[PDB]
């Protein structure tokens, strides 16, 4: 028993063990923190570094002996804090949430000291950690030796880990609040205070807004300068005049050089910000990106507060058609039931026709509800009135992509809609009521079936998925990239998934980052467009799709002829580095974890020319 199973030595002790110089704390968000920084409480810090403190004290010579040093620390005297600051001056530290999803689940930080007891985390990072501040705890560990410190700083440090390893894509995309404030800022108003002036540049734009003589999203003409990096990368400037809203100009000041102004000259939802930041990094590199992220984070909070982006019950405008469509639909359903009483239709046909009537009714409600809210703003511009996208709180939150979805608003403003038993059978009458007006008892009771089912599935799924991952990690762990080339000229061929008729994925995304197995045949015949083992990075992939390619042959890890391992060229690009992998890396765990995290999100319960 002591050996076998979950309680066995292997799991109990060997593959996981309690460690000194560790602590756990409750989490909090520190907006002031820079991305590389983390805030921790003095109390924990004082404990954690006692051996370090003693050394400095005896290096100071203030403590005659270890016991004396320990004795002084009990005082918590000012000098202790002075030494503690010196000790902690740059020492990296490790923070991990539990259970970890992936290697991003653990990252290194530089500490700052706090009077309270919670541990403070940068908001942008926590999202990657999947932290929700409803009470989440977190564990801290300190690397002791020189080698670990460099290891922690070189790899784990947050600045290194902007890219997801499951996909070479930024995991840092801003928060709900940060994105919304910018979204509100980047929106435009047809007419506004101070509208219609000409500004030399952002400098006066900020001043004019700060003085309140012009509104943030008021329309304005501006002069601006922007930089292009030449064929080699040398950045040269151009100046031009633009028509824009004021908020865009001020935000441009935060934008570093080398990025076209057009990307920001538009309303910026999470969609736009996601690709803007992603492209920015590739064009400019990492170092500007990390600092660029912080300024984005600071700005978003500041003007989100100024916006006063509150939400109120009055904001939830209800379409009058809701009653009309409901009454209209109800009449038709009654006809279907009567026709069944007439014998004109079977019960199943009677049933399914009714739900179709409801489906049309609900959608028409969605049409009316959604169309009204977005349309809800009529404004005067130098006389006469015009329509523009509504500044409604609810619409902005969903439209910005910060939170929710069209379904949520449809329930709240429209109807909770059709609903089903635990068996999945749809109740032959939907939940016609919205939430702005209360449910009826039975309607609410019906909803309980769905809600609990969702919780039930989650509970067992989370347990089942973990046991799956354990199986994955064990088998995968053995594989390691050790060779540069295995020698094969063979490979597999890649295509876009062609199902449900035409494609449902682009071949561009899949071939990216791989290596050819044979030279690419150029459009036409006998001409070769790419070498036989070219690292298929972005431009060539763009070049290929520019051509009439349908499929291409690439080397694969499975085809890799390596002994006791894998060859780098077969693996190609590293998701977390962009460039080809460094030799000596155990990919197997990475792949296992990559699959493991998303698995939790699953569930356990002629057409054209």
């Amino acid at each position: 028993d002591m050996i076998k199973g979950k309680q066995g030595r292997f799991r109990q002790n060997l593959l996981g063990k309690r460690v000194d110089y560790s602590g756990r704390s409750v989490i909090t968000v520190g907006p002031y923190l820079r991305l590389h920084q983390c805030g921790l409480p003095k109390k924990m810090a004082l404990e954690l570094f006692k051996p370090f403190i003693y050394g400095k004290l005896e290096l100071r010579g203030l403590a005659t002996t270890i016991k004396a040093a320990k004795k002084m620390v009990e005082r918590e005297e000012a000098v202790v804090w002075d030494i503690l600051d010196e000790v902690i001056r740059e020492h990296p530290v490790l923070l991990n949430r539990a259970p970890t999803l992936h290697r991003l689940g653990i990252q290194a930080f530089e500490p700052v000291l706090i009077e309270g007891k919670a541990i403070q985390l940068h908001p942008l990072v926590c999202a990657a950690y999947n932290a929700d501040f409803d009470g989440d705890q977190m564990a801290v560990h300190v690397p002791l030796t020189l080698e670990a410190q460099l290891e922690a700083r070189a790899l784990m440090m947050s600045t290194n880990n902007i890219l997801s390893p499951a996909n070479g894509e930024p995991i840092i995309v801003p928060s709900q609040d940060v994105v919304l404030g910018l979204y509100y800022m980047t929106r435009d108003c047809v007419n506004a205070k101070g509208e219609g002036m000409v500004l030399t540049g952002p400098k006066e734009a900020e001043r004019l807004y700060r003085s309140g003589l012009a509104s943030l999203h008021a329309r304005v003409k501006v002069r601006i300068t922007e930089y292009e990096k030449d064929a080699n990368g040398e950045l040269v400037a151009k100046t031009s005049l633009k028509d824009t809203t004021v908020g865009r100009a001020i935000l441009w000041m935060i934008v570093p050089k080398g990025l076209p102004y057009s990307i920001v000259n538009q309303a910026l939802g999470k969609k736009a910000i996601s690709k803007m930041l992603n492209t920015c990094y590739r064009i400019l590199g990492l170092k500007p990106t990390v600092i660029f992220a912080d300024q984005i984070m600071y700005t978003g909070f500041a003007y989100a507060a100024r916006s006063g982006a509150s939400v109120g019950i009055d904001d939830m405008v209800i379409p009058e058609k809701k009653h009309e469509i409901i009454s209209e639909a109800e009449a038709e359903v009654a006809e279907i039931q009567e026709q069944f009483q007439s014998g004109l239709v079977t019960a199943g046909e009677r049933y399914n026709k009714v739900i179709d009537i409801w489906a049309a009714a609900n959608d028409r409600v969605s049409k009316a509800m959604m169309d009204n809210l977005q349309t809800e703003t009529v404004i005067n511009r130098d006389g006469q009135e015009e329509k523009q996208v509504s500044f409604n709180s609810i619409y902005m939150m969903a439209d910005s992509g910060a939170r929710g979805s069209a379904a949520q608003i449809r329930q709240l403003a429209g109807m909770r809609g059709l609903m089903a038993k635990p068996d999945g059978s749809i109740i032959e009458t939907p939940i016609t009521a919205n939430f702005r007006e209360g449910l009826n008892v039975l309607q609410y009771f019906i909803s309980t079936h769905g809600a609990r089912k969702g919780l039930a599935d989650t509970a067992l799924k989370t347990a089942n998925s973990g046991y799956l991952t354990r199986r994955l990690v064990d088998v995968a762990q053995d594989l390691v990239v050790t060779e540069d080339d295995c020698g094969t000229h063979e490979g597999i061929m890649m295509t876009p998934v062609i199902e449900g008729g035409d494609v449902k994925e682009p071949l561009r995304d899949r071939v990216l980052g791989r290596v050819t197995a044979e030279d690419v045949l150029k459009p036409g015949t006998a001409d070769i467009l790419v070498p036989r083992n070219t690292l298929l990075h972005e431009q060539w992939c763009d070049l290929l799709e520019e051509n009439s390619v349908d499929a291409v042959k690439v080397r694969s890890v499975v085809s890799c002829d390596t002994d006791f391992g894998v060859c780098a060229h077969c693996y190609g690009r590293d998701l977390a580095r962009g460039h080809i992998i460094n030799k000596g890396e155990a990919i197997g765990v990475i792949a296992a974890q990559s699959i493991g995290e998303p698995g939790t999100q699953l569930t356990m319960r002629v057409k054209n020319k």
Partner: protein, 1320 residues
């Protein structure tokens, strides 16, 4: 409308519309009734200890024709009261004592008594009395026993889908589950043969039992199969056709009669064809003889002409067999009517499988299976078989079990024997066959009707009976062995086994819960909780989604929302507000009757099986005040399905909209608007709430606040109609109206408030007064508030001033922003109490003692102690400070010190000792002090008692022995001295003096008894013979990381404290208390919270305008008009008040209470609508939108456009950061494995989880990992050397080798395996 004095101080404004008839039933009814029913010595034979005994007794021995027979029991009063028992830290047990008759009947004669003796009240029992609040007091503990949901005793019918042996077949299952004893199961084999198995033992053919039940094959066939017949009628064996049996058939030959053909080969048969066939007398038809051969014979047959028997029932026919029986002279051959689907051959199928033939073989065979590899014996087999299902002592169906069973078989008679019988088995068997033949329907185990609730009383009794069974073995042997002429019953029965059984049951059973005393609501919801776990139930992992998911029958019976998070989901459930339990233990709910056209106030309770028959309208459905539904048709659930039905076409209506939810959900206002997910969270968080020091009340209420507080029992109640005269914040005493003053009674009632005392969750429960001397009270009025209560209104948290908006990211995510004002305002300051105790041991190197002469410890700590070595009450201490100066020889400071990292104040000393132990000065004074306190209460009680006794003397002194000039100056005991004969005055003086002495004696003996109890020591555990208990009080403010929750599932942690200047503030110069993240609202879909804040904001405004007038000297007329207009506002609300009547004095008193803010009620599903809210805002001082502009406290500039500003009720959860934050740099290590200790209680280190190692592995870092396990976890040598190097500033590690690895190697090597390390 009129109100009580307690009600007439905060008349909570209401908006509910429905004038519900039925009041909220008493909450704890289930528990109290359960135990009361169990504990009573009910003369009737059902339920309670009496029933258990009658089940067991009489108990007899074959040996001497001797028995001991049962007589009823006596129950003794408890040794100590609740608090004395609690203080002493023991179980609040009562003793059981019984009478029984022990007899010896005569041998060789009619069994008259040689000797019989009735027991001298043998005692063996200690059972915990259900405390007043329905809890049970255990040793130093208070516990709650939850109610268990278990599969009811009855017969079940089930089918499998897809699991049917992969064949795509349908498999049918039938099970009989007794109330007690062996399981019995019947099953349809994939090969369609019917098999039986006992207690999940190996498969057997059902027919074996039939033989065991002494039935022949022909009898078996007659029971199960209808006959089909052929007869020699002028030619070969014409068939006795019954045309109806041709249903769905196609003829294979000519079917003809009366010169008319009705069917021919290949032609189908139908009903109209059948009508002609029988109508035309087709009773005989010569089927082609080969068709006869296809059938199977229904009987065994003889060749009577030769006295020979050659034919077997179940034998399939052949043409020669037709000749053989005809050769035997038989006029008829009988065969078993069958159809390929309508009438299956399953019994015949089984008969072919069955190897057994006779009852001997059946009895032998079954015994063999029950007794594998054991000697059979015919009578042994029979007796064993009898035990299986035909003796209560091994198989028993309770009254409910039999009733349930009879209901299943569609018996109109529900009564029956507790044991089974042949017919009962046959009926069940046939039903399963009926289902197989497509003429039966399966049950739904999840349907409530199949499920019943067990309560404390029921479970305890069964546990009690089990103990008797273990007595049975002992007593029987003793009785068999005993001489019986000098042995007496106390010898025959010994307590130990029985006491243990109940004793261990309470302390160990999963259903026994260490009560979540967190807060008043936590207890009550915890007490009415339903669990599926435990014996006879499922297990937290073995539960399919279907069982977990809410079932339609749950409506109005089990709250669908309350189920707690985690694996408990769907397993743990709470009763509805109006829930009730049937005598059978079925959860039942009341409904109103649709009497013809009018719904009527008559109410009837139904179980789900009853509800299926009728149609029931929604509670909120409109009606015309006569009973007729305003709409001619209404929405109703008939068989759980939702459909609309006409007035007088519907049958019943639900009494109350709140009927669907439990109390925990009920407290959430505007629930109808909010999504279930958040709602569920809110309910659980309620019990998570911790009281606050400055607790006042909820503003936006639901209407449960008064009821919950009263039924909780934490508040004091007026037991009699009375007026108040005393206050000390420790006791309250009431003078009672004459109509409730009893003829030989004082006429006064006194109560003692419970003060600061650690809860089960380390929180104080001190009660507070809410009254004044001379103040009147009705019976049942609220006398004293308890934790989280005011005026008997449940008050968990605080009404905060809040707005929704982003604020510099500090409120991103659930993060909650907080103002320094709130902490200064004490809103969420809270008090915690911790207990620390020390024991003195019989250490073999010399026993321990408490002393101030601690070795080498500093003077300052010693100063904190007294000369007894004990810290003083009221002291203030910090981590490491000495509390108990206990020491060990060889002397040593084996003393108790404050835990590291905590500071608190000291209030308690309780000292205990074994018998034969000397006391100290501290204990003596405390013990004497408590004695004095009891005496003081007794004296004051005596003072009124004698005062009433004096009143009798003084009254007659008005007319006889008149001495009013010096009335009481002649002492009131000297009043007797009058030199009088039997005269009226003397008779009063002389007789009442005897009563005066008895009264004096009662206090004396009560006084003596009290101090004697207080004086005595305790039966401490061995190895220690004196104990001291110390309590420590901690006051806690709010810090970043504390967990905060709003009722609408909006939980979040707070992280900031701001200079009050920074907070956004309104044009009226008022800052907000809190700021919340707005983006959560659409994500959570709990808009109701916003409705709360809007309403609360309006409620505050009403109070403010009231406050301004009261702050001014506005005359009462203004106050009268303003308040009355406030209450009358709204739609057709149910509530009303008549302020004009209240003397203009209670108006001020009532009005003063209002100036804090208007308290409002909001029925769960009949709350106020927006239009009403808009009017209130207009009646207030705010726009109908409720949103306001605000200004940045940092810059003084206005925020863009209005924002939501409102007043919300907010709760503090018992999870504040300091109680969870933990850190360790260095510390001890475990012996069995050198890895660090674990957890917070011990100074353990964090566990580096297995998965997290993988994450580390994902990165290329290796040195970190090496250091992680070697240095930091599992290498004594390395970590010590590392320790020095750090002092040396090298920060370098030596590789080492994990010690635990050696442990594994040893263990493996300790196996039969040889394992080694290889150098090369």
């Amino acid at each position: 409308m009129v109100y009580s004095y307690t009600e007439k101080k905060r008349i909570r404004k209401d908006f509910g519309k429905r004038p519900q008839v039925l009041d909220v039933p008493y909450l704890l009814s289930i528990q109290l009734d359960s135990f009361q029913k169990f504990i009573e010595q009910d003369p009737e034979g059902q339920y309670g200890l009496e029933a258990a005994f009658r089940s067991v007794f009489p108990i007899q021995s074959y040996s001497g024709n001797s028995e001991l027979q049962y007589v009823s029991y006596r129950l003794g009063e408890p040794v100590f009261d609740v608090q004395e028992c609690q203080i002493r830290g023991v179980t609040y047990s009562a003793p059981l004592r019984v009478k029984l008759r022990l007899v010896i009947y005569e041998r060789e004669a009619p069994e008259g008594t040689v000797k019989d003796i009735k027991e001298q009240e043998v005692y063996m029992g200690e059972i915990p009395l259900m405390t007043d609040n329905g809890t049970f007091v255990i040793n130093g503990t208070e516990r709650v026993i939850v109610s268990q949901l278990h599969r009811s005793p009855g017969v079940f019918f089930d089918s499998d889908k897809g699991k049917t042996h992969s064949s795509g077949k349908v498999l049918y299952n039938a099970r009989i589950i007794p109330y007690r004893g062996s399981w019995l199961d019947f099953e349809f084999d994939p090969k369609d043969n019917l098999f039986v198995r006992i207690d999940r033992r190996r498969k057997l053919p059902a027919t074996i039992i039939l033989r065991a039940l002494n039935y022949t094959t022909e009898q078996i066939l007659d029971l199960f199969f209808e006959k089909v017949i052929f007869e020699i009628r002028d030619n070969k064996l014409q068939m006795e056709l019954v045309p109806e049996r041709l249903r769905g058939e196609t003829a294979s030959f000519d079917i003809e009669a009366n010169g008319k053909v009705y069917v021919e080969k290949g032609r189908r048969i139908t009903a109209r064809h059948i009508r002609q066939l029988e109508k035309d007398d087709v009773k005989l038809i010569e089927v082609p003889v080969e068709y006869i051969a296809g059938k199977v014979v229904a009987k065994d047959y003889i060749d009577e002409s030769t006295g020979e028997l050659i034919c077997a029932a179940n034998m399939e026919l052949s043409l020669d067999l037709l000749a053989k029986l005809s050769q035997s002279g038989h006029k008829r051959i009988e065969t078993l009517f069958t159809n390929d689907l309508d009438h299956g051959p399953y019994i015949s199928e089984t008969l072919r499988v069955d190897p057994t033939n006779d009852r001997l073989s059946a009895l032998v065979e079954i015994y063999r299976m029950m007794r594998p590899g054991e000697p059979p014996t015919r009578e042994a087999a029979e007796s064993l078989f009898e035990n299986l299902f035909f003796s209560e002592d091994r198989y028993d169906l309770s009254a409910v079990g039999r009733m349930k069973f009879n209901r299943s078989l569609l018996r109109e008679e529900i009564e029956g024997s507790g044991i089974l019988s042949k017919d009962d088995i046959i009926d069940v068997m046939k039903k399963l066959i009926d289902i197989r033949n497509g003429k039966g329907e399966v049950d739904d185990i999840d349907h409530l009707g199949n499920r019943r609730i067990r309560s404390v009383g029921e479970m305890a009794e069964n546990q009690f009976r089990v103990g008797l069974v273990r007595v049975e073995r002992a007593v029987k042997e003793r009785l068999s062995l005993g001489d019986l002429d000098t042995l007496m019953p106390q010898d025959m029965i010994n307590a130990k086994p029985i006491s243990a059984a109940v004793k261990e049951f309470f302390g160990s059973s999963q259903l026994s819960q260490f009560m979540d005393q967190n807060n008043p609501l936590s207890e009550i919801t915890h007490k009415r909780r339903i669990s599926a776990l435990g014996p006879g139930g499922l297990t937290r992992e073995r539960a399919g989604f279907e069982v977990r998911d809410v079932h339609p029958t749950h409506y109005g019976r089990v709250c669908p929302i309350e189920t707690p998070e985690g694996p408990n989901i769907g397993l743990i459930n709470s009763l509805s507000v109006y829930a009730q339990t049937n005598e059978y233990g079925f959860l039942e709910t009341p409904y109103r009757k649709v009497t013809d056209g009018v719904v009527t106030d008559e109410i009837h309770y139904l179980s789900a099986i009853e509800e299926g028959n009728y149609v029931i309208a929604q509670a909120n459905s409109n009606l015309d005040e006569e009973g007729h539904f305003v709409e001619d048709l209404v929405t109703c659930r008939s068989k759980g399905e939702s459909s609309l039905f006409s007035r007088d076409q519907v049958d019943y209506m639900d009494v109350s909209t709140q009927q669907v939810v439990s109390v925990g959900a009920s407290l959430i206002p505007f629930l109808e608007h909010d999504d279930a997910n958040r709602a569920l969270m809110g309910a659980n968080m309620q019990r998570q709430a911790v009281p606050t020091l400055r607790a006042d009340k909820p503003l936006v209420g639901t209407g449960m606040e008064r009821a919950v507080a009263v039924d909780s029992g934490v508040t004091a109640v007026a037991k009699r109609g009375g007026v108040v005269q005393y206050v000390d914040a420790s006791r309250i005493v009431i003078k009672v109206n004459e109509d409730e003053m009893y003829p030989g009674e004082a006429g006064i009632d006194i109560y003692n408030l419970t003060k600061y005392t650690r809860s089960n969750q380390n929180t104080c429960i001190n009660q507070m007064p809410c009254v004044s001397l001379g103040e009147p009270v009705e019976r049942g009025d609220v006398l004293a508030d308890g934790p989280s209560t005011d005026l008997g209104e449940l008050a968990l948290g605080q009404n905060m001033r809040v707005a929704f908006m982003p604020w510099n990211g500090y409120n991103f995510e659930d993060s909650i922003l907080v103002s320094e004002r709130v902490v200064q305002e004490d809103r969420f300051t809270t008090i915690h109490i911790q207990e620390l105790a020390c024991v003195s041991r019989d250490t073999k190197l010399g026993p321990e003692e408490i002393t101030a002469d601690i070795p080498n410890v500093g003077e300052a700590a010693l100063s904190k102690l007294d000369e007894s070595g004990i810290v003083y009450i009221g002291a203030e201490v910090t981590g490491g400070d000495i509390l108990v100066g206990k020491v060990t020889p060889k002397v040593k400071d084996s003393s108790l010190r404050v835990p590291n990292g905590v500071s608190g104040t000291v209030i308690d000393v309780q000292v205990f000792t074994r018998d034969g132990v000397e006391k100290d000065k501290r204990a003596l004074e405390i013990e004497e002090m408590q004695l004095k306190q009891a005496k003081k209460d007794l004296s004051e009680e005596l003072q009124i008692l004698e005062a009433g006794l004096f009143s009798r003397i003084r009254a007659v002194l008005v007319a006889g022995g008149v001495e009013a000039e010096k009335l009481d100056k002649l002492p009131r005991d000297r009043w007797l001295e009058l030199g009088l004969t039997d005269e009226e005055k003397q008779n009063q003086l002389e007789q009442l003096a005897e009563q005066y002495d008895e009264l004096k004696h009662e206090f004396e003996k009560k006084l003596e008894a009290k101090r004697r109890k207080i004086t005595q020591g305790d039966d401490l555990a061995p190895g220690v013979l004196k104990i001291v208990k110390v309590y420590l009080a901690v006051k806690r403010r709010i810090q970043p990381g504390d967990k905060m929750a709003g009722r609408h599932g909006n939980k979040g942690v707070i992280s900031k404290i701001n200079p009050i200047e920074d907070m956004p503030y309104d044009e009226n110069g008022t800052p907000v208390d809190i700021v919340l993240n707005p983006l959560g609202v659409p994500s959570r879909m709990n808009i109701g919270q916003i409705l709360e804040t809007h309403l609360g904001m309006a409620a505050k405004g009403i109070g403010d305008k009231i406050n301004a007038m009261l702050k001014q000297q506005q005359e009462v007329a203004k106050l009268r008009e303003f308040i009355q207009r406030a209450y009358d506002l709204g739609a057709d609300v149910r509530q009303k008040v008549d302020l004009s009547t209240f003397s203009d004095e209670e108006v001020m008193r009532l009005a003063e209470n209002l100036r804090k803010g208007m308290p409002i009620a909001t029925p769960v599903f009949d709350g106020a609508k927006e239009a009403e809210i808009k009017e209130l805002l207009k009646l207030g001082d705010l726009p109908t939108s409720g949103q306001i502009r605000l200004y940045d406290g940092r810059t003084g500039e206005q925020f863009e456009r209005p924002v939501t500003v409102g007043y919300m009720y907010m709760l503090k959860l018992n999870h504040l950061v300091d109680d969870k934050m933990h850190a360790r740099s260095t510390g001890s290590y475990s012996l069995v494995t050198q890895q660090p200790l674990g957890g917070k209680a011990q100074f353990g280190g964090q566990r580096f989880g297995e998965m997290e190692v993988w994450a580390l592995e994902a990165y290329g870092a290796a040195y970190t990992l090496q250091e992680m396990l070697t240095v930091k976890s599992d290498d004594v040598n390395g970590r010590t050397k590392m320790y020095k190097n750090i002092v040396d500033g090298n920060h370098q590690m030596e590789p080492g080798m994990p010690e635990s690895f050696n442990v594994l190697l040893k263990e493996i090597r300790s196996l039969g395996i040889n394992i080694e390390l290889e150098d090369e």
